[PDB]
Design a protein around this ligand. Structure first.
Ligand code: S1I
Ligand code: S1I
Lengths: 5, 236, 236, 5
């Protein structure tokens, strides 16, 4: 999965 | 409000204790109680709220993905019918996740966003609103999925418009908003080119503003810039 | 019984799904429902029950330790009074932990232990009974602490007596029982010499019986023997 | 902490 913050 | 009888300051104190103990459900309940006192949230308090619910829903999302994967395999050609249990339990976790998202969205709508006038608060809350509609979109399949997606898009877009007018390109809230809106484009809206363009433009505009920052601000901004680069590397 | 309307087999199926999703509270609730159907538990089912509650209470114990540590520091000479919140929240987590332990102990008493006649079931359940009284002892401070300790000791001792009569020295349940009873001696009963003697004798008697085992049984027994050695290295 | 299983 891609990074989120 | 089961926290209605506890002092606001005590709720904030206990949220910090819950964080140290990695008790994020408790942390979220304490911060919901604090929001429901009706006062605006400070910078620290906004982040306590967001950290708590991000961790709760993040665990729900990870569990949902495990169960959805199992459910999809049970539906392949050749699988032995295992009955309704996988679907039922995936639905149970999904309903709990939707409930947490609705709770957060309810706090933002009553009345955090409407009282938020400064960019750092208003952009922060509108980003959260996009994030929790994005999580609802991840599990949505019905008549409402398009509307959920558009609700996420609309919140992110309002946040983006304010952030570009009122914050420098290195502001960590602005950067994290762009990171997440880019993921929305890639994973939810079937717009990988928009996702890549947004991540790249955000990264480049931040790079050109790093020279204005202190060492501590530099470390924060470059951390999120590295996440933008990470995603670009995943996608190209 | 909120699980009273669900089939026993469906509860077991969902416990396994919850395990895969690392949803151990759900797993424990499903297995409590299965126990309350009134039938004896198979080997696999006993381990699903134990894994679920071990993970739930293990997280509670880790949180309690964090909060107790903070509370002790707040009580040192020189600390600034922070009010009742640390104590209150430690008490909240403690009460929830005690509740989980009481729930497990209640399942063992109604009626898992009394129907367990085979060594592998009876020793397994009596070990659990010692373990959950040990967790109650870790937080106990009142008129009841000695009695809680003696309840743990008594359950472990009955399990030990059966295991020495009915199981080989490499049996993993026998080994794990001895590991944990040794920790009880060291950490709860203020008997480090007993703890060390038990771990060493258990290790040596297992070593001498490894030659009888298949490769798969050997791997299981040597795993727990290594934990015995680990503790001995910590304690000497 | 010591190991238990
Ligand atoms: N957890 C606690 N007790 C406390 C936390 C704070 C605190 C204080 C100031 C800032 C932050 N964080 C951020 O503004 C964001 O996160 C960042 C992530 C990486 C780098 C920089 C910021 C920006 C990106 C985001 F998406 F909007 C999430 C929030 C938090 C005080 S106390
Ligand atoms: N989690 C699942 N779905 C499933 C688990 C099983 C299963 C099946 C057979 C045995 C085991 N385990 C054990 O008998 C013990 O654990 C061991 C620990 C290390 C090495 C060997 C055994 C022995 C020590 C202890 F303290 F009594 C805890 C239990 C589990 C089937 S399904």
């Amino acid at each position: 999965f891609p990074a989120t913050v | 409000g089961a926290m209605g009888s506890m002092e606001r300051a005590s709720l904030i104190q206990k949220a910090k204790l819950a964080e140290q103990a990695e008790r994020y459900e408790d942390m979220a309940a304490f911060m919901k109680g604090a929001v429901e006192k009706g006062e605006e949230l400070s910078c620290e308090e906004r982040n306590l709220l967001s950290v708590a619910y991000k961790n709760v829903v993040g665990g729900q999302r990870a569990a949902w993905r495990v169960l959805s994967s199992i459910e999809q395999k049970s539906n392949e050609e050749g699988s032995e019918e295992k009955g309704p249990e996988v679907r039922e339990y995936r639905e149970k976790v999904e309903t709990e996740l939707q409930g947490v998202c609705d709770t957060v969205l309810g706090l933002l709508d009553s009345h955090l966003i409407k009282e938020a006038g400064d960019a750092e608060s208003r952009v922060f809350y509108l980003k959260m609103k996009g994030d929790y509609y994005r999580y609802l979109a991840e599990v949505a399949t019905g008549d409402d999925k398009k509307r959920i997606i558009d609700s996420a898009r609309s919140a992110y877009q309002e946040a983006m418009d304010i952030s570009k007018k009122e914050m420098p390109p290195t502001n960590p809230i602005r950067l994290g908003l762009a990171l997440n809106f880019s993921v929305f484009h890639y994973e939810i809206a079937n717009s990988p080119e928009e996702a890549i363009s947004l991540a790249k433009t955000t990264f480049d505009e931040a790079m050109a503003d790093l020279h204005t920052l202190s060492e501590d601000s530099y470390k924060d901004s470059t951390l999120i810039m590295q996440l933008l680069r990470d995603n670009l590397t995943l996608w190209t």
